[PDB]
């Protein structure tokens, strides 16, 4: 009986764990891509600040 119950719970555990692993992989992919996008946006924002202070200096 214990072996049968094991087999059942083990199959259930594997079935949910494959999906959990896929979900975790997708989550980390999304997090890394979000970090990359944030890096790009921050670089663009810093460049915009640079050109804005350049405009201020040139105007003065």
């Amino acid at each position: 009986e214990a072996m049968l119950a094991k087999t059942a719970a083990d199959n259930r555990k594997s079935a949910e764990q494959v999906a959990a692993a896929q979900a975790d992989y997708e989550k980390e992919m999304a997090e890394a891509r979000a970090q990359a996008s944030a890096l790009r946006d921050e670089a663009r924002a810093a460049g915009r600040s640079v050109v804005d202070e350049k405009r201020a200096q040139a105007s003065g």
Partner: protein
Amino acid sequence: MSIFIGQLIGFAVIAFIIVKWVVPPVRTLMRNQQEAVRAALAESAEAAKK
């Protein structure tokens, strides 16, 4: 001694009836139980492997 012969023929008939009609079904039931438990063990092994 005649009654001994009578019972011996009767027991031969009983054994024939058994081996003809009762042994096959009970043997099949035993085989089915054995195969069920064997399949359960194989499934457990496959579950561990999975």
